[PDB]
Short mmCIF file of C-alpha atoms in Angstrom, two decimals:
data_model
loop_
_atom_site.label_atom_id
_atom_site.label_comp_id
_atom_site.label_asym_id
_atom_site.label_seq_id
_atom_site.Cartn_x
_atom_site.Cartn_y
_atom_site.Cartn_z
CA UNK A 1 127.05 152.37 79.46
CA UNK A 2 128.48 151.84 82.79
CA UNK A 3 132.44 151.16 81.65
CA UNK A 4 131.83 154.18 79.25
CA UNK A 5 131.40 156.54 82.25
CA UNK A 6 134.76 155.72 84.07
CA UNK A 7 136.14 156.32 80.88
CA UNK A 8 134.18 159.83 80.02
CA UNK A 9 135.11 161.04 83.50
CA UNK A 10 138.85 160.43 82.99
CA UNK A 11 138.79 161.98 80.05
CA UNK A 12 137.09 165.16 81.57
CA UNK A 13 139.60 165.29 84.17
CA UNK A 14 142.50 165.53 81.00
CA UNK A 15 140.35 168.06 79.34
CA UNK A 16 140.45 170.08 82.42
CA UNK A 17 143.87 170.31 82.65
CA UNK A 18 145.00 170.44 79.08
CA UNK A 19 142.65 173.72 79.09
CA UNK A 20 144.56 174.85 82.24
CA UNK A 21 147.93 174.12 80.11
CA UNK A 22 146.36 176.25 77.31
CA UNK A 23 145.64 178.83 79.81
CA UNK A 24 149.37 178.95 81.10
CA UNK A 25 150.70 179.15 77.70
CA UNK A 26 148.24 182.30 76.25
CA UNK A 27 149.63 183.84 79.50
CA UNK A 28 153.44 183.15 78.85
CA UNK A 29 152.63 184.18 75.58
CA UNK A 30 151.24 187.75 76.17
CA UNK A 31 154.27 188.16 78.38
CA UNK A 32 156.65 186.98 75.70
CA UNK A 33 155.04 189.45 73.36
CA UNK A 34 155.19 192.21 76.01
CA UNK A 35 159.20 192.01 76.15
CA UNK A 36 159.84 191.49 72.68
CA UNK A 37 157.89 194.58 71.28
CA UNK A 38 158.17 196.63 74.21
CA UNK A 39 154.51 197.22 75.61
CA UNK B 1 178.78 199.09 73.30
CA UNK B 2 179.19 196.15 75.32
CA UNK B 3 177.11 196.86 78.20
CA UNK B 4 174.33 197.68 75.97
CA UNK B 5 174.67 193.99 74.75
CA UNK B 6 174.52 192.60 78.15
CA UNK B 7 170.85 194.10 78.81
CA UNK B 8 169.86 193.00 75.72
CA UNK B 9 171.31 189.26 75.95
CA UNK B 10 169.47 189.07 79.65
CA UNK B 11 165.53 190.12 78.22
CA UNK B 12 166.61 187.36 75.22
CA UNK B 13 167.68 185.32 78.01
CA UNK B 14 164.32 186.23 79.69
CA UNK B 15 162.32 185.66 76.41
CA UNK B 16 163.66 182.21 75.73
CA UNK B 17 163.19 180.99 78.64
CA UNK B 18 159.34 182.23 78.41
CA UNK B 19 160.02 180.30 74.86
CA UNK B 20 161.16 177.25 77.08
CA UNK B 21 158.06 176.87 79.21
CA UNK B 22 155.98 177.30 76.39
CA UNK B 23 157.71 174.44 74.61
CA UNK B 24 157.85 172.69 77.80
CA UNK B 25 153.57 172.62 78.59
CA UNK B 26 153.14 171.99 74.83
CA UNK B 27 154.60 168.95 75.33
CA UNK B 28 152.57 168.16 78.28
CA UNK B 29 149.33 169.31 76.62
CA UNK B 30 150.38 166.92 73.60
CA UNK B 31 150.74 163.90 76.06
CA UNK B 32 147.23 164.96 77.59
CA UNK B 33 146.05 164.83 74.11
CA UNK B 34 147.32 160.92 73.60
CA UNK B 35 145.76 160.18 76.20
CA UNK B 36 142.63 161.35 75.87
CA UNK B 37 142.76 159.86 72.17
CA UNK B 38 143.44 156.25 74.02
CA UNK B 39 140.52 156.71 76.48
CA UNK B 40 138.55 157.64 73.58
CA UNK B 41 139.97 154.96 71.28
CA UNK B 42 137.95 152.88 73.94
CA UNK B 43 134.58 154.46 74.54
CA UNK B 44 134.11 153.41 71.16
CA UNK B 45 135.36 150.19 71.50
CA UNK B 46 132.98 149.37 74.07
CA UNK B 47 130.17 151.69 73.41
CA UNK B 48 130.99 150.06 69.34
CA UNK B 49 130.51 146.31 71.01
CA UNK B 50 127.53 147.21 73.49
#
């Protein structure tokens, strides 16, 4: 279990950002939808 | 009529560009997600053999 964990703690690292990505684009998002309905 | 059109072109300018990001950290978040597929593809592998 000891190659596993190098690999399990990369692939925390890529979770972290890709939920930092999903963060940015909610964001961009609610903007978006702020300009085109007028709010 | 025309300068009406020109504020409305710039938010649609703004918007798309918005659009563009969006489409632009997709993309990244669609890499991350190979990637963590191939690291994943190997825990397995190993964690299959061991």
């Amino acid at each position: 279990r000891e190659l596993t964990d190098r690999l399990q703690a990369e692939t925390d690292q890529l979770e972290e950002e890709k939920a930092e990505l999903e963060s940015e684009i909610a964001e961009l998002q609610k903007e978006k939808e702020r300009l085109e309905f007028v709010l």
